[PDB]
Design a protein around this nucleic acid. Structure first.
Ligand code: MG
Ligand code: MG
Ligand code: MG
Ligand code: MG
Ligand code: MG
Ligand code: MG
Ligand code: MG
Ligand code: MG
Ligand code: MG
Ligand code: MG
Ligand code: MG
Ligand code: MG
Ligand code: MG
Ligand code: MG
Ligand code: MG
Ligand code: MG
Ligand code: MG
Ligand code: MG
Ligand code: MG
Ligand code: MG
Ligand code: MG
Ligand code: MG
Ligand code: MG
Ligand code: MG
Ligand code: MG
Ligand code: MG
Ligand code: MG
Ligand code: MG
Ligand code: MG
Ligand code: MG
Ligand code: MG
Ligand code: MG
Ligand code: MG
Ligand code: MG
Ligand code: MG
Ligand code: MG
Ligand code: MG
Ligand code: MG
Ligand code: MG
Ligand code: MG
Ligand code: MG
Ligand code: MG
Ligand code: MG
Ligand code: MG
Ligand code: MG
Ligand code: MG
Ligand code: MG
Ligand code: MG
Ligand code: MG
Ligand code: MG
Ligand code: MG
Ligand code: MG
Ligand code: MG
Ligand code: MG
Ligand code: MG
Ligand code: MG
Lengths: 154, 75, 133
RNA sequence: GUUAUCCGGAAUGAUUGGGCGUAAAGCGUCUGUAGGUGGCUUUUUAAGUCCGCCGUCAAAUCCCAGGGCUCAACCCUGGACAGGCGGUGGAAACUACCAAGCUGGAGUACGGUAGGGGCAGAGGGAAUUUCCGGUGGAGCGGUGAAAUGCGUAGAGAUCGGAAAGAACACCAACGGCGAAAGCACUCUGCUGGGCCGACACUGACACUGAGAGACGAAAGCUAGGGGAGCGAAUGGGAUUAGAUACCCCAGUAGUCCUAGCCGUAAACGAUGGAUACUAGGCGCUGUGCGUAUCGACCCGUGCAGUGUUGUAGCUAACGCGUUAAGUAUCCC
């Protein structure tokens, strides 16, 4: 999914040397997602490079039986800060462009999110990845703390 | 010798070093470096007197009557 | 040292971020209790006491590095809530729970210090010392 | 649909929820009054805090559950979470209070030791300028190139004499002290701090600071001195289209001293203060310990400050990085 297409410029003695930068995320909508960034002379080629760079950068988002987040989380990348919190089933995904495409492509069905701090697409994507990467699923906190699930449930 | 850490001895040592410094402040008035110190030390003595007034009223009034220290600015 | 609690918490956070298992903290009823609780929750490996020149030091072993020092998925977070400038209190029904309960909340109440879980069983509110992830 | 009004989005006045090295933003620097926060241990009390019960916070509205107008809007019944205030019964961890304790915080005494710290009083030499002589006898001085200027009324040069003021070469160093400003030829006197080693002692006396106070480069001003050099202003010579500038020749205020006033600076680390806690490497200054010898090193180390690279972490990037711009608390 192509998030953003921009025309960046290098300048040479001749004139303006034009390129396209594409920010693109890939997902299966099944709980596997990644971000990637690419650069080329043509829209198509940059799209493609972005595709590959993403595929080799990819990770997995912890999910809950209802297709949502384990818990509430913040994240920080550059000047982009990102706020995610779990939702009740049937609320859909409500968020802004970068965060929303990332989460939607991960396959998260119900999520609250707001990017605070900056607006830049790319950074917000990476921040979202940082968020959902640090998410701890309950089985694993049970295993870490060394305490049975039902005891933390209460 | 008595208590060299006691409230009343410390306040005495301060009061005395102050009245000793007053003479040098008079002969040379253009030494500010010294006066800055005098203000510091006088500040310490004032502090201990206030503390001592909080803790014990009798010892305090006895002391500032004894060493001829001016009555406090809380009135 | 205007606040001792925040200080303990802080030393822990610092030793933790630096990937060191061992911490020296200064002991106190609050300190000791807090650490006890920290152990029965399973956030910290082991604790013990030392004494020199009438000073008490609790040394704390900390949970080992996660499958290397470099690739860490998890850190261990601590946050002061009620602090000398603003004291935060809560009744029974406002008692906080951290990340759906995965973490814990420390309460100082009438019956002593405890977790939010204990407060919920016994039905007491009180002063919230800190949050622990 | 357009216009107007209000909240939103706006984290764009921020408790939840921001910042202040360079983006707007740290008072120039201290001393300190109110004010706010404040180490550990035991007891007390129960003001906060917490739990139970009661009174009330009118009905209508909002929320939940039914009922009625064909439905809905609307109407009707019943009930309640919040949250506020008041009475009463309990709980005693934290803040607060009351009583006694404790040193690691802050001080006092003792003994050391470095220092351009400050004020005051003595003394010293180069160099320069002018004046008085002797020699000597045409140019000196100056610029990119010149000219004004000084010179046969004997300049410059050189030797000898006096007199005066101001500044202190080498040492000097990516060194010392100071709150900052600043402080350096030498000496002596009066005095401020700082640090270190010992339990010798008090036993929280702490940290910050609205107002308020003191200090505060240079220029400037009032009054009296002083006046060599330098030199705003001013004048002449050039340069230039012009030159009220750069360059040169002269040179008044001022620069100095005494007694005041002014209170500002890129007063800069462009970084408020206190505390606690988080790899190192290479350095320096002051001290202490052990070792080396029995006195200078030397080594290893403990502190206190000071400088340079750099891990974690932070940051928009540059970079900062135990002297944080890191992780936390308090005050301005
Ligand atoms: Mg390439
Ligand atoms: Mg940030
Ligand atoms: Mg926004
Ligand atoms: Mg309440
Ligand atoms: Mg309309
Ligand atoms: Mg707002
Ligand atoms: Mg605004
Ligand atoms: Mg801002
Ligand atoms: Mg600027
Ligand atoms: Mg600025
Ligand atoms: Mg400053
Ligand atoms: Mg400034
Ligand atoms: Mg001012
Ligand atoms: Mg102060
Ligand atoms: Mg006070
Ligand atoms: Mg108090
Ligand atoms: Mg306390
Ligand atoms: Mg009503
Ligand atoms: Mg209804
Ligand atoms: Mg009906
Ligand atoms: Mg009703
Ligand atoms: Mg009520
Ligand atoms: Mg009541
Ligand atoms: Mg008690
Ligand atoms: Mg007491
Ligand atoms: Mg003098
Ligand atoms: Mg001479
Ligand atoms: Mg002749
Ligand atoms: Mg002529
Ligand atoms: Mg003549
Ligand atoms: Mg002749
Ligand atoms: Mg001559
Ligand atoms: Mg002379
Ligand atoms: Mg210094
Ligand atoms: Mg000087
Ligand atoms: Mg001295
Ligand atoms: Mg005693
Ligand atoms: Mg002020
Ligand atoms: Mg003044
Ligand atoms: Mg002047
Ligand atoms: Mg004038
Ligand atoms: Mg004059
Ligand atoms: Mg003159
Ligand atoms: Mg001149
Ligand atoms: Mg002219
Ligand atoms: Mg004239
Ligand atoms: Mg002309
Ligand atoms: Mg002249
Ligand atoms: Mg003067
Ligand atoms: Mg200013
Ligand atoms: Mg300066
Ligand atoms: Mg050597
Ligand atoms: Mg140091
Ligand atoms: Mg540096
Ligand atoms: Mg560095
Ligand atoms: Mg910053």
């Amino acid at each position: 999914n192509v998030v953003q297409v921009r025309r960046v410029t290098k300048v040479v003695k001749g004139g303006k040397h034009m390129r396209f930068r594409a920010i693109v995320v890939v997902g299966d909508k099944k709980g596997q997602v990644g971000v990637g960034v690419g650069k080329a002379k043509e829209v198509v080629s940059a799209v493609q490079k972005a595709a590959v760079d993403a595929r080799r950068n990819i990770i997995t988002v912890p999910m809950t039986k209802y297709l949502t987040f384990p818990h509430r989380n913040e994240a920080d990348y550059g000047a982009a800060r990102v706020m995610l919190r779990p939702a009740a089933p049937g609320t859909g995904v409500i968020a802004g462009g970068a965060v929303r495409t990332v989460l939607e492509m991960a396959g998260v069905e119900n999520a609250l999110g707001k990017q605070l701090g900056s607006n830049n697409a790319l950074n917000n994507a990476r921040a979202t990845i940082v968020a959902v990467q640090t998410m701890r699923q309950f089985s694993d906190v049970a295993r870490d703390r060394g305490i049975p699930m039902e005891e933390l449930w209460k | 010798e008595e208590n060299k850490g006691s409230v009343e001895f410390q306040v005495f040592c301060f009061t005395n070093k102050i009245r000793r410094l007053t003479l040098h402040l008079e002969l040379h008035k253009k030494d500010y470096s010294s006066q800055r110190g005098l203000r510091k030390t006088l500040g310490k003595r004032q502090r201990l007197l206030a503390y001592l007034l909080k803790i014990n009223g009798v010892r305090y009034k006895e002391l500032i009557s004894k060493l001829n220290i001016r009555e406090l600015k809380t009135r | 040292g205007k606040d001792t609690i925040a200080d303990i918490i802080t030393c822990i956070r610092n030793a933790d971020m630096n990937r060191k298992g061992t911490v020296r903290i200064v002991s106190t009823n609050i300190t000791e209790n807090i650490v006890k609780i920290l152990l029965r929750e399973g956030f910290i490996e082991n604790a013990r006491k030392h004494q020199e020149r009438n000073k008490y030091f609790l040394v704390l072993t900390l949970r080992h590095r996660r499958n290397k020092k470099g690739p860490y998925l998890n850190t261990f977070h601590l946050k002061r809530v009620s602090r000398p400038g603003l004291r935060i209190y809560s009744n029974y029904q406002r008692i906080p729970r951290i990340l759906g309960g995965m973490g814990i909340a420390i309460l100082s109440t009438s019956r002593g210090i405890m977790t939010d879980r204990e407060a919920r069983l016994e039905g007491i509110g009180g002063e919230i010392l800190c949050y622990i992830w």
